Design a binder for this molecule. Sequence first.
Ligand code: UMA
Ligand code: ANP
Ligand code: CL
Ligand code: CL
Ligand code: CL
Ligand code: MG
Length: 439
Amino acid sequence: ADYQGKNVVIIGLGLTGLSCVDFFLARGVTPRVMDTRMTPPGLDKLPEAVERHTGSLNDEWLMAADLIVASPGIALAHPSLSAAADAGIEIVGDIELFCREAQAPIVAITGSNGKSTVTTLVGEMAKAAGVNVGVGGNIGLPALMLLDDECELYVLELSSFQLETTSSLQAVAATILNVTEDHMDRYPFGLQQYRAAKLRIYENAKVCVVNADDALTMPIRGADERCVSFGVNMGDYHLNHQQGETWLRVKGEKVLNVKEMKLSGQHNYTNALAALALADAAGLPRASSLKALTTFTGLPHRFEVVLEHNGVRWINDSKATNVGSTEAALNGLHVDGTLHLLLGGDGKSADFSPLARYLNGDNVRLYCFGRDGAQLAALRPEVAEQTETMEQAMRLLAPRVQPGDMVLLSPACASLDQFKNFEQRGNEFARLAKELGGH
Ligand SMILES: CC(=O)N[C@H]1[C@@H](OP(=O)(O)OP(=O)(O)OC[C@H]2O[C@@H](n3ccc(=O)[nH]c3=O)[C@H](O)[C@@H]2O)O[C@H](CO)[C@@H](O)[C@@H]1O[C@H](C)C(=O)N[C@@H](C)C(=O)O
Ligand SMILES: Nc1ncnc2c1ncn2[C@@H]1O[C@H](COP(=O)(O)OP(=O)(O)NP(=O)(O)O)[C@@H](O)[C@H]1O
Ligand SMILES: [Cl-]
Ligand SMILES: [Cl-]
Ligand SMILES: [Cl-]
Ligand SMILES: [Mg+2]
């Protein structure tokens, strides 16, 4: 694409917006940047030559633009951005800018849960085959920073927000892993509007990898000749549960006994199936892809044991930012004593009621904090405490922890009401777990 001489306006002074500033400046185009927040996090990292506007969107700049580049955190429905769209001004995101430049095949992964795990697994499968791979997107490395003439494969984690502003993605293989309620504060037409955003990932994809157990993952006009499926008891890629033993199978053939994996849990076995299906579709050798499933140890903040001491496990699942993710932590969870569950933050208008069925019985205590703490404590008030902060909650629960207990941060909410990012939340939990749970 050619941006020379164009009036380019970037919305959002966070990670994405800064990556876009650098992208345009490296091509000789000086953009302008705006953000609705008075003091956005990237403000002090912005090059001195770039004009900036904070505290609101600037309609003089938007209506003058030839190209608007919207960070995923700004809604297209914002009245100023909707007005620019009504005037026919082109609006794209960083993923669109990336797709217009990329010169290697793209594997594209979305879904409500499991995206970073599957994205990282496909990257590891590529590395095991000796492929120069770039892994990024919503996982936290902005995609424009991956562009490299020597890269042989890109693996992108994509959010619904990023997909809304993307029109030129033609993935070699694309998946929606699952669709469960999230981001409802951004989707006022509800679950099907959120789904519609994700369904964009399949447009012009060579192979679509769908979840046979989740009908909302199937393409917009229905499953077609491009579609390969994964699932538990059915699918092209599926599981088989022998006597105390689980295998990954592909079209009637065993490929891996999951005892060789370092991850566990049925949802991680279906994540492994989805990753294998994507890698197969990208042409990666099966043997090296299977090897990578056995070496991958998991990601920080995803059901991460940060301390095991005195018979207590302290588990950082800060990446559980929606109900479905916390459900995956609780479903089938084994705790010898009491589960001390930390819930809270920015609930994004979620209905938390699906969690209540996991919170019965005599061995569960809730510690609820942040913006929506009260709504979480209402799941079962008789076992719940509410604090302002996670630190207060941890200092409250720590004296009550007995050998055999589990302390689980799986908050079902985003972190931005009180933290810079979910990593800061998990890191603070880990620091407090070490202080309160160790000698
Ligand atoms: C909210 C979102 O989409 N965040 C992703 C984004 O990070 P970045 O720092 O660029 O975010 P952003 O677009 O600046 O938005 C962050 C926050 O700033 C707020 N914001 C942003 C712009 C603005 O003018 N005003 C404003 O108030 C947004 O409402 C949002 O709450 O780009 C990064 C690189 O692609 C992603 O790693 C990061 O994923 C984070 C982990 C995330 O929470 N993603 C969501 C979608 C999710 O996983 O559920
Ligand atoms: N298939 C799955 N279904 C449900 N939850 C999952 C699945 N895979 C992983 N998780 C959980 O989802 C959370 C995040 O995992 P990750 O692989 O980072 O997914 P994400 O899509 O990048 N983020 P999120 O939207 O919070 O799941 C963790 O709490 C995982 O335990
Ligand atoms: Cl250019
Ligand atoms: Cl079998
Ligand atoms: Cl967050
Ligand atoms: Mg999300």
